[PDB]
Amino acid sequence: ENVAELKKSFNRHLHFTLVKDRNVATTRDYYFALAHTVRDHLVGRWIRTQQHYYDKCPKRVYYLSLEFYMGRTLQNTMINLGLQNACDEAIYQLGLDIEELEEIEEDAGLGNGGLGRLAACFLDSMATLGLAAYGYGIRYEYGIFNQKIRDGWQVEEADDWLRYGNPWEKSRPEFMLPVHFYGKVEHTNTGTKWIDTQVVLALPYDTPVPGYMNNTVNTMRLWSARAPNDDYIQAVLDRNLAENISRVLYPNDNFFEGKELRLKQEYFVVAATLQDIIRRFKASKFVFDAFPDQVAIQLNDTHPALAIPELMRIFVDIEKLPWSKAWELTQKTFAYTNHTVLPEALERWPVDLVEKLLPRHLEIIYEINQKHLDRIVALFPKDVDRLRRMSLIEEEGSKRINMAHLCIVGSHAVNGVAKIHSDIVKTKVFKDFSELEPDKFQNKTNGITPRRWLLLCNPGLAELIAEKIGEDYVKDLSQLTKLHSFLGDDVFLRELAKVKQENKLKFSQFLETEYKVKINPSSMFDVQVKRIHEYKRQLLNCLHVITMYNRIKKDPKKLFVPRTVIIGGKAAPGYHMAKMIIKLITSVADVVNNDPMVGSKLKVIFLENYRVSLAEKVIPATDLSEQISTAGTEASGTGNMKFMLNGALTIGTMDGANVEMAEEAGEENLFIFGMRIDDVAALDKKGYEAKEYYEALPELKLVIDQIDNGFFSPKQPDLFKDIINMLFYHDRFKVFADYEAYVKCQDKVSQLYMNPKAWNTMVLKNIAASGKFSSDRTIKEYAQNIWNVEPSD
Amino acid sequence: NVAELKKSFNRHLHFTLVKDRNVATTRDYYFALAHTVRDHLVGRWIRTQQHYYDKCPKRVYYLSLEFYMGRTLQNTMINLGLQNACDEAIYQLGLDIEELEEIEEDAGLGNGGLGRLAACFLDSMATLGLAAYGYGIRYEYGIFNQKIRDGWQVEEADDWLRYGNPWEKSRPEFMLPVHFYGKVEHTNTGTKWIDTQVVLALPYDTPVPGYMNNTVNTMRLWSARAPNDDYIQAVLDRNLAENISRVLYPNDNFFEGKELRLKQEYFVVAATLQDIIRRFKASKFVFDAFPDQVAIQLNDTHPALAIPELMRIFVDIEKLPWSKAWELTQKTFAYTNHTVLPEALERWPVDLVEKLLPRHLEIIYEINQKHLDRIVALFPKDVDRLRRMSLIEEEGSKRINMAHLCIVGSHAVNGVAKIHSDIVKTKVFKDFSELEPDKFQNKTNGITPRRWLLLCNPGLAELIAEKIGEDYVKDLSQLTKLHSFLGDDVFLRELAKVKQENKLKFSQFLETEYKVKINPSSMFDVQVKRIHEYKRQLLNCLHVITMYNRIKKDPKKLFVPRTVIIGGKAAPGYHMAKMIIKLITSVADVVNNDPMVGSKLKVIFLENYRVSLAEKVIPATDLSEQISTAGTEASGTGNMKFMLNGALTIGTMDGANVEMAEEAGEENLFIFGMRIDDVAALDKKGYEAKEYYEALPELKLVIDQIDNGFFSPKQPDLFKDIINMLFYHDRFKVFADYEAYVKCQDKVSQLYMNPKAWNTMVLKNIAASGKFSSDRTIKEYAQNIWNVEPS
Ligand SMILES: O=C(N[C@@H](Cc1ccccc1)C(=O)N1CC(C(=O)O)C1)c1cc2cc(Cl)ccc2[nH]1
Ligand SMILES: O=C(N[C@@H](Cc1ccccc1)C(=O)N1CC(C(=O)O)C1)c1cc2cc(Cl)ccc2[nH]1
Ligand SMILES: *Cc1c(COP(=O)(O)O)cnc(C)c1O
Ligand SMILES: *Cc1c(COP(=O)(O)O)cnc(C)c1O
Ligand SMILES: CC(=O)N[C@@H]1O[C@H](CO)[C@@H](O)[C@H](O)[C@H]1O
Ligand SMILES: CC(=O)N[C@@H]1O[C@H](CO)[C@@H](O)[C@H](O)[C@H]1O
Ligand SMILES: O=c1[nH]c(=O)c2[nH]c(=O)[nH]c2[nH]1
Ligand SMILES: O=c1[nH]c(=O)c2[nH]c(=O)[nH]c2[nH]1
């Protein structure tokens, strides 16, 4: 692992592994040679780590999720193994540029957004905390689509991420497992049998998860679907049908699409995972009574809800345990995390679909529900409507299964991902269940890993911090509070601002080479990157942008703090409003960026193909972080945390974790604005009439009229009709209701920005208070209050 | 040495497979050893390709839809001179070398002889140091794995890439786009093919090591990938473009005009020519010198589209004038004809080609117009000559005669054995050969002595080497030196011992798989090849039943016992072939369970015959059944394998059987039945199967038994379709050779009773098989068609 030896290993791989010499090698070949050179460093500790779990049998944690938004692996691995500086030197001596090799790697974009990225941060924190934890998901052949912008509109291109090979994954043939679908059920005198099923094989692929500087390397096991081997041509081609189960990730963020294929993916990952878990338990040097003391399975949202009735199926139908005992061990095994409260995102599978595909699971679900309601009928004999409300089944016409209800009764703990969120989940949405079981509902505020989101993406900052207070903060982020000691340290504030500046220059180079636009390197980088959603409101942001443009058009010489406004994110393919909003933004940017009067005063960029590796670039270069969801809509958020950690100030609503960010850093140190949760409720009751604000606010009217009259789309004056219509008559995210307070807030931001010392002092107060948001703290609370597992430091 | 090989093995097990000894699976050990051996290929492979770039010798491109490679581990260890050392390392590591080798999947990207010939050719060309490349398709599924259920063949997908193939190397930087459908636009800027669907071609290189010479050549196989410009359905529909290289069409000697198959043919052809042209432009070489640097061999008519594709490239893209382009095209291409069976002839319907490849149809018409215009000038009156020589067949359904396209587009056309080449030249393509005599040639097939001797039969190879040295491996003609042992009884017993060892080793195989108990004392009678009416395993079956009915009558007669093995795959849609298999499993059930017969005779249908199995059953064979109707087996190569391995041949004067007889002495082979002329006369006179049936009492019983349910009591008329074919539609004259065949078989048994005489004849066969080395075949191709030299 020294420089001379890394060059030798690199040359060795280029030769024997890539079959090339320095004359014919491609950049991809060099990336692969380096990837293998680094990968070899994981082996020893990966084998030892998994071997140690078997010998000492610590209770294991299984994080079951349909998503793992991993981003790239090369750099992350080098950093957690302490190999980056040496590799950087080696590659440089070989006459190459490691950063260029790094760009060849495809993101493992096996997720949509926060839910999937939370899982990824969790694996890093769990390996860093030394827990015997495993991530279980699906090895999608195609991840979240690559986004292109054509004529101002989003276009989707398949993310063929495995086309050239994934050196970071390991096929595990010996652990293949069969998964069953369809068929029929038989209640024989030897137990109930699920027969005449269609079989799809699940081949597992393991990816190492290195902890930060601790010799621990855990595993991420992703399952891939394969047709079993018992017109000939057509029969062989049809093998594709089974293989389509793990073909592509469903691209919806916070939205439920009840497609049968999605249901197939859900049972696929759940069946393979649990059978693999039980297999390992049975081989452990451990009857099943100890199962719950040896296994904890965390449900990442309701997507893997079928795991509950699958575990019961295994215990009852296979292991021959009596229902009562099976049920007991089941509840003690599962814990569920609720990640959302938007109606349209709720998973409610029609009973008929479940009956056809998973007949044995439907039966078990009905039983679960029966024992569920019988107990309620007991405690509350009269309340008939209570039974209707707590039922796992919704019989209102098209009968369907309420997966969240199934997760609640089958789990011993249910948690939200931010205080305000967990409160609403416990006291509103699931009141009937929490009153019945107080101690079941918990909170576990989200977090982000400071390796990827600090050390990796912003080395200049990580280094500056380390020089002031040491490196202990990497593994204990609450150590950042020591930074408070430097609030009056002028030289340190200058050093802090220089790091932001350099990040800004570096990213301005990315922008200019990727887009036409000329970037004012000194302007304020106002950023909003996240999935496109009406509730996240990049639309509100767009109104503010148009507002700023008009102010410039009117008073061209007024002292204006220059800005580069960046907005990026993917829209789900079938989400019409989301796609219209993107087109609006690109249209606005085209006018702004090409109007001679504004020039270098204001530049607008719709950041294309926002994904993990691109978040690592833009976040460190950000001055103002846009976290403006309508109060009550963002369960927690985590992008908000990344910006805080990287030196940006936040303009947002009192929503999700924005509330706890305010508590930690001091509310005066964030630009909070708009309606809070109570204001939204009150405005609801009264009835929200969008027209009022439009008529009542002149700057807003001009904006609205311009969008509506074709100012931003001359060739198609009515192009934005749907946006206008939704805004006046169907906006449940009250865009106009926060417009005023939002714009007033934005002006205060510009005011502060003119005061570099005041601005950087507040930045320091944010960075110094960001410690709570490390996923290491989130995982400690999960380990202690839910999984009952302990580290190894 | 051995210490370093063991060290690399442990290094690969650890870093490449992520395992230690107490957790490794047998498959990890195989992969670890494969990687250890593979590393030894790299230096020479890089050097060999670099050398071709540096000295720019003319390059040979063998374009085929099939490469029946089999397993690669052992073959690589042998050709690299590493087997003993690796055998030692694995032994010292406490592992079973044979167990690891059996883990490897056959790369079965071929149907039978056509695809195996390409593989043997790759090995010989690399061993002769020719700058040669193989170009084909990387099918996800090769020829299906065959199982027998209730006596019938059942097919399973050959998912050979499931666990990974260490022997292939993806070459991402050489991915190319291939076009389909679309339309032709005739502009003032020059005719363009527009609005096409695109499919990417990703090449994968597999190294081809020559035997002990530092040469490592390349076999480049193409895999179809969808390009990247309802969302979910759009992503799933990428499966459609990728279906082009999904599976090998399971037909041997049969034309199935499916569209997907036409797509595969254009795919390999389009990717291949573009890549070849790209390599020409990058070389240190206008195009005038293209044919002096490039030779492309068309393996049968399957890649015939390559002729109009090269023209399309030269003309539509490179803007060369038609005349110039056509001249270059003919000098580049050479066509190998592999069959004369009418059902095997590729004739694509014009409508299909126009829909999928409209610009190629226009080009084909043009080539045809210019072609017929020449014929009109040389024979003004001969109207029918134009009809017989046109690439187009206008009768009702217009279709393209791909064979004709290949002939007019090539400078050399060859068959694969004397008898066949003569038929192709003076009969099937008489109007063409008469116009250009020199164009048609012969190149008798061969098999590589590495895979088919040194590897599959180490015992025989060691015996031969002990007596005549090792020079024969690279110069098989040296086998004639074994004649010096014609009298030696010590050598003859040695020879018989080796055969015994193989029979014993293989017998152990047959019983762990089959219920039957083998008589080790018995003569191994083997017919392994694809199930075909023309190959006649049916005739063989008539003999087995004939033999059974003889034992039943005279249980006490002195009889040479036999283990009769017949094995082969039937094309899934080939009904007769499938009936024939059911007939054989049925007959075997009756014979194998009859108390009165017992160890006197046993029958086995060898399931899943394929390259790795062939390597086992061939060296254990005493009698090789090569009985196609005279004129139907263009050449055959299994005949040659058996000859090299110590088996005597019972066969017709067909394909290369004729030449085997010329080399070893007609009396040293058991030749029988009708010859090309006799079949010709019988056809003239008309064939009435009933006659031989009436005239031959042993035959009558055999048939009545089949037809009345003797071999299928549960379903008495099960073989009705077979009876109907033998009597009123048997164009391969099974009954007409029944009598001579049975008599011939009796003579085989006679000689078998005399061990010294039997092995004396084997020696004469092994000593005369030198001609059948693919190394001899390749040299002829090199000198007379491609105009290239070794190194
Ligand atoms: O596949 C080889 N190396 C591998 C190296 C590799 C492995 C994993 C990820 C990226 C690269 C290779 O090039 N790829 C695997 C990818 C795929 O599956 O498409 C691409 C290889 C080396 C080699 C050397 C010889 Cl001599 C013969 C065959 C060989 N294959
Ligand atoms: O895939 C790895 N090695 C390879 C080794 C290999 C390569 C080619 C054929 C067989 C085996 C592997 O196991 N396979 C490629 C096959 C496939 O395509 O499914 C199976 C590998 C090694 C490794 C080491 C670490 Cl630390 C992490 C991930 C890793 N993957
Ligand atoms: C962190 C992250 C998210 C979640 O961001 P929010 O602003 O909390 O919605 C989404 N996508 C990517 C690529 C991320 O890295
Ligand atoms: C050699 C070979 C053949 C060709 O056999 P013929 O008897 O010439 O048809 C067919 N299949 C396999 C697997 C072979 O090795
Ligand atoms: C269904 C879903 O994707 N929910 C998302 O989950 C992440 C992780 O908890 C939250 O931060 C975010 O606010 C929320 O929208
Ligand atoms: C079309 C086809 O598969 N033809 C086969 O080709 C091989 C290779 O030349 C011959 O040995 C054999 O007789 C013949 O049947
Ligand atoms: O197809 C959709 N995907 C979504 O993510 C979404 N969100 C929404 O409101 N509608 C839709 N539609
Ligand atoms: O599907 C078929 N494959 C063949 O190889 C063949 N041969 C034949 O005569 N008929 C058929 N059918």
Q: How many helices (H) and strands (E) does chain A have?
A: 32, 25
Q: Of B196, B758, B253, which is closest to residue B496 (Cα–Cα)? A: B758
- Residue B167: closest CA among chain A residues belongs to which residue? A17
The secondary element (H helix, E strand) that includes residue A147 is strand A146-150
Closest residue by CA, ligand 3 atom 5:
A639
Burial class (CB in 10 A: 0-12, 13-18, 19+), A724: middle
Q: Of A155, A130, A133, which is closest to residue A145 (Cα–Cα)? A: A155
Burial class (CB in 10 A: 0-12, 13-18, 19+), A159: buried
Distance CA B394, CA B401 (A): 10
Q: Do domains A2-447+775-791 and A448-774 have the same CATH topology?
A: yes
A617/chain B closest Cα distance in angstroms:
25
Q: Do A158 and B235 touch (CB under 8 A)?
A: yes
Q: Is A250 in the pocket of ligand 2 (CB under 6 A)?
A: no
- Residue B109 β-bridge partners: B67
Instruction: Return the beta strands (E) in A367-519 as ranges.
Output: 393-394, 400-402, 414-416, 441-443
Tokens 């609005």 correspond to what residue?
B195
CA distances A498 to A460, A601, A621, A750, Å, are: 9, 22, 11, 19
User: Quick check: helix, strand or coil at residue A230?
Assistant: coil
Q: Of A659, A682, A681, which is closest to residue A670 (Cα–Cα)? A: A659
DSSP A95: T
Q: Tokens in use for B364?
A: 């084909």
Distance CA A502, CA A500 (A): 6
The topology (CATH level 3) of B447-773 is Rossmann fold (3.40.50)
User: Quick check: helix, strand or coil at residue A532?
Assistant: coil
CA distances A538 to A514, A566, A580, A683, A727, Å, are: 22, 10, 12, 21, 13
Distance CA B606, CA B569 (A): 10
CA distances B497 to B461, B525, B759, Å, are: 13, 18, 11
The secondary element (H helix, E strand) that includes residue A53 is helix A27-56
Q: Do A19 and B46 touch (CB under 8 A)?
A: yes
Q: How far is CA B255 from the centre of its chain?
A: 16
For residue A448, which ligand has an atom nearest its CA?
3
Terminal C-alpha separation, chain B? 28
Contacts of A443 (CB under 8 A, 6+ apart): A415, A416, A417, A418, A419, A421, A422, A423
Q: How many residues does chain A have?
A: 793
- Residue B166: closest CA among chain A residues belongs to which residue? A17
- Residue A209 β-bridge partners: A218
Give catalytic status of residue A498 as yes or no.
no
Q: How many residues does chain B have?
A: 791
For residue B254, which ligand has an atom nearest its CA?
8
Q: Is B166 in the pocket of ligand 2 (CB under 6 A)?
A: yes
Q: Of A193, A201, A179, which is closest to residue A357 (Cα–Cα)? A: A179
Contacts of A254 (CB under 8 A, 6+ apart): A340, A342, A344, A345, A531, A533, A535
Q: Tokens in use for A247?
A: 């073909």
Is position B20 annotated in a ligand binding site? yes
In sequence order, what DSSP letters do the residues of B88-122 get, joined into one string? HHHHHTT--HHHHHTTSPPEEE--SHHHHHHHHHH
Q: Of A611, A638, A622, A621, which is closest to residue A770 (Cα–Cα)? A: A638
Q: Of B303, B271, B291, which is closest to residue B66 (Cα–Cα)? A: B303
- Residue B170 β-bridge partners: B204
Q: Is B16 in the pocket of ligand 2 (CB under 6 A)?
A: yes
Distance CA B381, CA A696 (A): 97
Distance CA A601, CA A526 (A): 13
Distance CA A17, CA A451 (A): 30
Q: Strand B294-299 relative to strand B333-336: parallel, antiparallel, unpaired?
A: parallel
The secondary element (H helix, E strand) that includes residue A374 is helix A359-379
HEC states along A696-759? HCHHHHHHHHHHHHCCCCCCCCCCCHHHHHHHHHCCCCCHHHHHHHHHHHHHHHHHHHCCHHHH
Q: Of B247, B37, B258, B272, which is closest to residue B139 (Cα–Cα)? A: B247
Contacts of B201 (CB under 8 A, 6+ apart): B175, B176, B177, B178, B222, B223, B224, B225, B267, B270, B271
> Cβ contacts (< 8 Å) between B225 and chain A: which residues?
160, 163
Q: Tokens in use for B618?
A: 């061939």
Q: Please list the helix, strand and coil fractions of chain A in percent, rounded to the nearest 5, in that order.
A: 55, 15, 30
Distance CA B738, CA A584 (A): 85
Q: Do B247 and A229 touch (CB under 8 A)?
A: no
User: Quick check: helix, strand or coil at residue B384?
Assistant: helix
The secondary element (H helix, E strand) that includes residue A225 is strand A217-226
Closest residue by CA, ligand 7 atom 1:
A574
Q: Are A341 and A303 in contact (CB under 8 A)?
A: no
Q: What single letter denotes the amino acid at residue A206?
A: D
Q: Tokens in use for A163?
A: 């086309």
Q: Tokens in use for B564?
A: 């009769």
Distance CA A481, CA B107 (A): 63
Q: Are A269 and A304 in contact (CB under 8 A)?
A: yes
User: Quick check: helix, strand or coil at residue B192?
Assistant: strand
DSSP A787: I
Distance CA B665, CA B663 (A): 6
HEC states along B269-330? HHHHHHHHHHHHHHCCCCCCCHHHHEEEEEECCCCCCHHHHHHHHHHHHCCCCHHHHHHHHH
Note the helical H segments in B350-411.
350-356, 358-378, 383-389, 402-409
Spans of all domains in chain B:
1-446+774-789, 447-773
In sequence order, what DSSP letters do the residues of B666-713 get, joined into one string? GGGSEE-S--HHHHHHHHHH---HHHHHHH-HHHHHHHHHHHTTTT-T
Q: Tokens in use for B211?
A: 């035997």
User: Quick check: helix, strand or coil at residue A296?
Assistant: strand
Distance CA A376, CA A372 (A): 7
Q: Of B401, B626, B403, which is closest to residue B529 (Cα–Cα)? A: B626
A-B C-beta contacts closer than 8 Å:
100
Closest residue by CA, ligand 4 atom 7:
B638
Is position A400 annotated in a ligand binding site? no
User: Quick check: helix, strand or coil at residue A171?
Assistant: strand
Q: What is the resolution of this structure in A?
A: 2.1
Q: Strand A108-110 relative to strand A198-210: parallel, antiparallel, unpaired?
A: unpaired
The minimal CB distance from B157 to the residues A173, A229, A574 is found for A229
Distance CA A774, CA A461 (A): 16
How many CA atoms does the CB half-sphere of A368 hold within 13 Å?
Answer: 32
Q: What single letter denotes the amino acid at residue A460?
A: G
For residue A226, which ligand has an atom nearest its CA?
2
Q: Are A621 and A504 in contact (CB under 8 A)?
A: yes
Q: Of A652, A648, A654, A656, which is closest to residue A628 (Cα–Cα)? A: A652
Pick the CATH number of A448-774 from 3.90.700.10, 3.40.50.300, 3.40.50.2000, 3.30.2130.10: 3.40.50.2000
Q: Which atom of ligand 8 is nearest to the CA of B532?
A: 7
CA distances A23 to A15, A27, B39, B173, B740, Å, are: 12, 11, 20, 14, 66
Q: What angle do CA B99, B105, B107 make, to 5 degrees?
A: 145
Residue B738 main-chain phi, psi, to 5 deg: -60, -50
Tokens 């299964």 correspond to what residue?
A401
Buried b / exposed e along B228-239 (16+ C-beta atoms within 10 A):
eeeebeebbebb
CATH class of this structure's domain A2-447+775-791: alpha beta
Q: What single letter denotes the amino acid at residue B741?
A: Y
Q: Of A607, A593, A609, which is closest to residue A520 (Cα–Cα)? A: A593
Residue B756 main-chain phi, psi, to 5 deg: -65, -40
Q: Do B42 and A174 touch (CB under 8 A)?
A: no
Q: What angle do CA A255, A257, A258 make, to 5 degrees?
A: 140
Give catalytic status of residue A603 as yes or no.
no
Q: Do A148 and B229 touch (CB under 8 A)?
A: yes
HEC states along A623-655? CEEEECCCCCCCCCCCHHHHHHHCCCEEEECCC
Q: Do A227 and B163 touch (CB under 8 A)?
A: no
The topology (CATH level 3) of B1-446+774-789 is Rossmann fold (3.40.50)
Distance from the alpha carbon of residue A727 to the mean position of ligand 7, in angstroms? 17
Q: Are B152 and B569 in contact (CB under 8 A)?
A: no
Q: Which atom of ligand 4 is nearest to the CA of B528?
A: 7
Note the helical H segments in A106-166.
114-128
Q: Are A673 and A647 in contact (CB under 8 A)?
A: no
Q: How far is CA B164 from the centre of its chain?
A: 24
> Cβ contacts (< 8 Å) between B172 and chain A: which residues?
26, 28, 163-164
Q: Are A84 and A4 in contact (CB under 8 A)?
A: no
Q: Tokens in use for B311?
A: 């023209």
Residue of B13, B14, B18, B169 best suited for mutating to test ligand 2, as the one with most atoms within 8 Å of CB: B18
Distance CA B552, CA B562 (A): 15
For residue B577, which ligand has an atom nearest its CA?
8
Q: Tokens in use for B122?
A: 């790759």
Q: Is A611 in the pocket of ligand 3 (CB under 6 A)?
A: yes
Q: What angle do CA B91, B95, B98 make, to 5 degrees?
A: 90
DSSP B447: B
Q: Are B153 and A248 in contact (CB under 8 A)?
A: no
Q: Are A480 and A771 in contact (CB under 8 A)?
A: yes
Q: Of B453, B463, B454, B458, which is closest to residue B485 (Cα–Cα)? A: B463
Distance CA B4, CA A214 (A): 33
Q: How far is CA B448 from the centre of its chain?
A: 12
DSSP B437: T
Distance from the alpha carbon of residue A164 to the mean position of ligand 1, in angstroms? 9
Is position A279 annotated in a ligand binding site? yes
CA distances A3 to A6, A94, A306, A313, B119, Å, are: 5, 11, 50, 54, 45
> Cβ contacts (< 8 Å) between A142 and chain B: which residues?
235
Q: Using CA of residue B229, residue B233, residue B239, residue B241, what is the dihedral sign?
A: negative
The secondary element (H helix, E strand) that includes residue B491 is helix B489-513
Q: Tokens in use for B561?
A: 């016992």
Q: Is B116 in the pocket of ligand 4 (CB under 6 A)?
A: yes
Residue A393 main-chain phi, psi, to 5 deg: -110, 135
Is position A446 annotated in a ligand binding site? no
Residue of A254, A298, A337, A644 best suited for mutating to test ligand 5, as the one with most atoms within 8 Å of CB: A254
User: Quick check: helix, strand or coil at residue B245?
Assistant: helix
User: Quick check: helix, strand or coil at residue B67?
Assistant: strand
The secondary element (H helix, E strand) that includes residue A185 is strand A184-188
Where does chain A break, by residue before each gap (C–N > 2.5 Å)?
230, 286
Closest residue by CA, ligand 5 atom 8:
A115
- Residue A453: CB atoms within 10 Å: 28
Q: Tokens in use for A70?
A: 């991993």
Q: Are B346 and B403 in contact (CB under 8 A)?
A: yes
How many CA atoms does the CB half-sphere of B189 hold within 13 Å?
Answer: 5
CA distances B750 to B77, B539, B597, B673, B747, Å, are: 42, 21, 20, 19, 5
Q: Are B16 and A36 in contact (CB under 8 A)?
A: no
Q: Are A292 and A339 in contact (CB under 8 A)?
A: no
Q: Do B229 and A155 touch (CB under 8 A)?
A: yes
How many CA atoms does the CB half-sphere of A635 hold within 13 Å?
Answer: 24
Distance from the alpha carbon of residue A397 to the mean position of ligand 8, in angstroms? 55
Q: Strand A198-210 relative to strand A177-181: parallel, antiparallel, unpaired?
A: antiparallel
Contacts of B50 (CB under 8 A, 6+ apart): none
Q: Of A534, A590, A606, A526, which is closest to residue A562 (Cα–Cα)? A: A526
Distance CA A732, CA B675 (A): 90
Distance CA A338, CA A298 (A): 11
